[PDB]
Design a protein around this nucleic acid. Structure first.
Ligand SMILES: [Mg+2]
Lengths: 380, 532
DNA sequence: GTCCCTGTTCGGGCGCCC
DNA sequence: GGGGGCGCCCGAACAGGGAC
């Protein structure tokens, strides 16, 4: 087969990311898996003359996962329908990618190191000989084939939609509970997007209002004024004239009482005028609400939310990791991109454990936030 | 040695080194032998390249510029083997390879860059891995690995710990069979051109290995000798700290924090006498005979942490009480502001990641914090936080949040409306408050920031209020710090605030938007911004 | 943007190993 | 007047958010 020449981008070298500590069972598994990829010629041993490295690990059958995030950033550079259909299924189609040799000039960039319990042995390095599972250029090379491989299925069933993201293949159908399940199976032989509801903003309803209650109300509404323009705090703020004790009871005026009702009015509709730009970066912010509940918003410019939502359910690390993948999944289905997350967790805490809970083919980029104890008050 | 070479290049646009230089009679002594045995070769003036040499009976070459122009390597040494990761073996041998590097051929097309010259008052090339060349360690370790593989495949149930050129070999065999197998390994290495001098073949315990003393059932460190200076340079403390960090892997309760903080913006340093205490206490502990044990996979791994005081922590990892595999410490100051529960989280993380390296799994913890306190903190904290499977162990001083913040306002308590303001050109500020009971106060500050004036404001309120207080602040900054419940800070002001918080029976802190003409926040702002 | 401040990575000192 | 690794500590440099 003809290998397709690939390059990096101008003025940018290959990945040099250090391997990280691995559990015995993950190493054991990886060593088992790597041998047969070596035995079958899919990977070949290399040494330190190759200056590149990309992290590897295993998620559980185990499945080798390679964090090609750095390579993906460095390699040369969608159905609205899928988002619409009652049932969408996700397949693991990565193994297909091994059936295509890779430009030998490029292979040096795919190098990884298997670590060693108690450093009994130096690392054992391997290179990819074929399109690696999880790499950006893999879908681009194998697409012309892919179109061909399943077009019978597509013309046999035009009301079933298939979308491809990396090793993932998204297949969505409007068919009933059990016939979705059975026209899946002739694809393997060959999750519903409309159950996703926007999480609105809500104001507390109560019979009696204190100075504190109002302050907290005026603070929340003030913030919401950024996302919602119409909101007004004028009438409420003046109930707080002078320096009152926080527990004091404040009778609501006529004018404030429905300025609130009008504020409740605005928040009661959908936000307008936000449009997904494929060229721009996609951002997800997550907040911990306690309760085993998590709020998130997806946006491209600050306050321009493409979507807001809620992941609700205790393991803070596991839950956040699980929130990250559910959120990411959605963002692929809807937009075909993964978003850079802003995570409310310390870097080291997250780096300690997130791989013990990951069950996806991809890995999103993320950074870490020193978050306000405030924006928590805003999505309740 | 029939090892095949590893191909090496310089970086794409660069050329070899051209540097120039009575240890000379020492050097000709050595170099002449090295040529006799083929480690080097003489070259003529046609070869343009040269790198400096020097001697210390030992010859070494300064290859700094060569190294700069040499390609990058992926280092294959990912860490250091540790004794507590060793499983108990019936028969054990420790071995060393002699002239490791020089038994390993360099890349013929590369050798001309290793050119050097013994000086005049004779020029050579390297034919093997030079010492001081950047690529040699990785190329050796990688090569040693490939050399050891056929034997490793053949003897799957023999453990070879392979560290550069040092070999620990353990087996479950009786001492005769085992010695045979060691010999077979020795013959294997010779065929690949690697000599293991008998003089470095250790056939009985205690085994000297990697800095340790390996006995059959227990291990220990080789003697540690702390430097006992009269005057203390910044470096002597760094040396002393490092020696104490190395001891803390098996000597319990080693402390470094106070010795550590003597190094800030820093020549000789007076020992703060908080330091000479922990030093002296450390000196006492090194008079103790201690030992560790080996690892049994059929048992649970258990870590246990204690608080030494002032963000200083000690731990022990064991499987059976009183017989711990390893010990250790944590004392990192992470964050400008912190508390004990944060740091215990951090200590748990260090130990976890350390255990994954040494044992390939995570220990069960034994922590001096009540399940309650943890759940309390986990509640009030906004970013995600977690600790694995753990027991509570009643071992004072227990770990606690020193104060708490009210979730609701305190009825009847005086409400302080605090604010602060600072001018950026003049660095002049004002902090103060306005309260419900009619009280009012403004102080001015020299050399301050806006974030500092907001901290003063809050501090003011806590000094002047009674045992209970509601505070309202328009400062995202100050609220962020205080809602995290620090008990330690780099900031004196935050520390002062902390001593106050500990004293109150109840504190409630609330946030309001600034500049929205709201409550007494406008009143105190006007008092406080006046002049700024 | 600035300033401030808090977080992280980086490089250097020391330790230890080869 | 040399190299590679891991750890611990520091300050310096940089990124990013809040408040001007
Ligand atoms: Mg103000």
């Amino acid at each position: 087969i003809e290998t397709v020449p690939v390059k990096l981008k101008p003025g940018m070298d290959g990945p040099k990311v250090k391997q990280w500590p691995l559990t015995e069972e993950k190493i054991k598994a990886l060593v088992e898996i790597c041998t047969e990829m070596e035995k079958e010629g899919k990977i070949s041993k290399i040494g330190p003359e190759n200056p590149y490295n990309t992290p590897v690990f295993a998620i559980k059958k185990w499945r080798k996962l390679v964090d090609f995030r750095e390579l993906n950033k460095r390699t040369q550079d969608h159905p609205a329908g899928l988002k619409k259909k009652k049932s969408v299924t996700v397949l693991d189609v990565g193994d297909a990618y091994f059936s295509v040799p890779l430009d030998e000039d490029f292979r040096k960039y795919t190098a990884f190191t298997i670590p060693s319990i108690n450093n009994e042995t130096p690392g054992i390095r391997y290179q990819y000989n074929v399109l690696p599972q999880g790499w950006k250029g893999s879908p681009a090379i194998f697409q012309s084939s892919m179109t061909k491989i399943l077009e019978p299925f597509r013309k046999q069933n035009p009301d079933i939609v298939i979308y491809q993201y990396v090793d993932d293949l998204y297949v969505g159908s409007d068919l009933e509970i059990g016939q979705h399940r059975t026209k899946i199976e002739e694809l393997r032989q060959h999750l519903h997007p409309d159950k996703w509801t926007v999480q609105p903003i809500v104001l507390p309803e109560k019979d009696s209002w204190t100075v504190n209650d109002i302050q907290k109300l005026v603070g929340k509404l003030n913030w919401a004024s950024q996302i919602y323009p119409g909101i007004k705090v004028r009438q409420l703020s003046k109930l707080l004239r002078g320096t009152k004790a926080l527990t004091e009871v404040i009778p609501l005026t006529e004018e404030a009482e429905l300025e609130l009702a009008e504020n409740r009015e605005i928040l009661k509709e959908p936000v307008h005028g936000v449009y997904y730009d494929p060229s721009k970066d996609l951002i997800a912010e997550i907040q911990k609400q306690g309760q085993g509940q998590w709020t998130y918003q997806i946006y491209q410019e600050p306050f321009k939310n493409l979507k807001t939502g809620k992941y609700a359910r205790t393991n803070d690390v596991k839950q956040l990791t699980e929130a990250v993948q559910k959120i990411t999944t959605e963002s692929i289905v809807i937009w075909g991109k993964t978003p850079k997350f802003k995570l409310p967790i310390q870097k080291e805490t997250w780096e300690t454990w997130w791989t013990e809970y990951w069950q996806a083919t991809w890995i999103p980029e993320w950074e870490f936030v020193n978050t306000p104890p405030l924006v928590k008050l805003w999505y309740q | 040695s029939p090892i095949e070479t590893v191909p090496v290049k310089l970086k794409p646009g660069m050329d070899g080194p051209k540097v120039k230089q009575e240890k000379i009679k020492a050097l000709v002594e050595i170099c002449t032998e090295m040529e006799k045995e083929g480690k080097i070769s003489k070259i003529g003036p046609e070869n343009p390249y040269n790198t400096p040499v020097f001697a210390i009976w030992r010859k070494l070459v300064d290859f700094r510029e060569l190294n700069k122009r040499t390609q990058d390597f992926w280092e294959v040494q990912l860490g250091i083997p540790h004794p507590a990761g060793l499983k108990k073996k019936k028969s054990v041998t420790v071995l060393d390879v002699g002239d490791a590097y020089f038994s390993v051929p360099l890349d013929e097309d590369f050798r001309k860059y290793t050119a050097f010259t013994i000086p005049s008052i004779i020029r050579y090339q390297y034919n093997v891995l030079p010492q001081g060349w950047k690529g040699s360690p990785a190329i050796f370790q990688s090569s040693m690995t490939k050399i050891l593989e056929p034997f490793r495949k053949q003897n799957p149930d023999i453990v070879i710990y392979q560290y550069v050129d040092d070999l620990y070999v353990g087996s479950d065999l009786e001492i005769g069979q085992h010695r045979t197998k060691i010999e077979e390994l020795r013959q294997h290495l010779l065929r690949w051109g690697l000599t293991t001098p008998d003089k470095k073949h250790q056939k009985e315990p205690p085994f000297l290995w990697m800095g340790y003393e390996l006995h059959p059932d227990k291990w220990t460190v080789q003697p540690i000798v702390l430097p006992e200076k009269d005057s203390w340079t910044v470096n002597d403390i760094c040396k002393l700290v490092g020696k104490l960090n190395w001891a803390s892997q098996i000597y319990p309760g080693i402390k470094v924090r106070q010795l550590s903080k003597l190094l800030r913006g820093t020549e000789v340093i007076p020992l703060t006498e908080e330091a000479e205490l922990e030093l002296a206490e450390n000196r006492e502990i090194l008079k103790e005979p201690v030992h560790g044990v080996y690892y049994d996979p059929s048992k649970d791994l258990i870590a246990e942490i204690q608080k030494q005081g002032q963000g200083q922590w000690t731990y022990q990892i064991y499987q059976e009480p009183f017989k711990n595999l390893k010990t250790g410490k944590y004392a990192r100051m992470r964050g400008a502001h912190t508390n004990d529960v944060k740091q215990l989280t951090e200590a748990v993380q260090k130990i976890t990641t350390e255990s994954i390296v040494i044992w390939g799994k995570t220990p069960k913890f034994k922590l001096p914090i009540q399940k309650e306190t943890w759940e309390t903190w986990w509640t009030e904290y906004w970013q995600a936080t977690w600790i694995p499977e753990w027991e509570f162990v009643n071992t004072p001083p227990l770990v606690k949040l020193w104060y708490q913040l009210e979730k609701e306002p305190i009825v009847g308590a005086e409400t302080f409306y605090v604010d602060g303001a600072a001018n950026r050109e003049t660095k002049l500020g004002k902090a103060g408050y306005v309260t419900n009971r009619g009280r009012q106060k403004v102080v001015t500050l020299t050399d301050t920031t806006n974030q500092k004036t907001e901290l003063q404001a809050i501090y003011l309120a806590l000094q002047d209020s009674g045992l209970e207080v509601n505070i309202v602040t328009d400062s995202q900054y100050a609220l962020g710090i205080i809602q995290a419940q620090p008990d330690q800070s780099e900031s004196e002001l935050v520390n002062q605030i902390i001593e106050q918080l500990i004293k109150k029976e109840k504190v409630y802190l609330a946030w309001v938007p600034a500049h929205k003409g709201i409550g007494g926040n406008e009143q105190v702002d006007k008092l406080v911004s006046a002049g700024i």
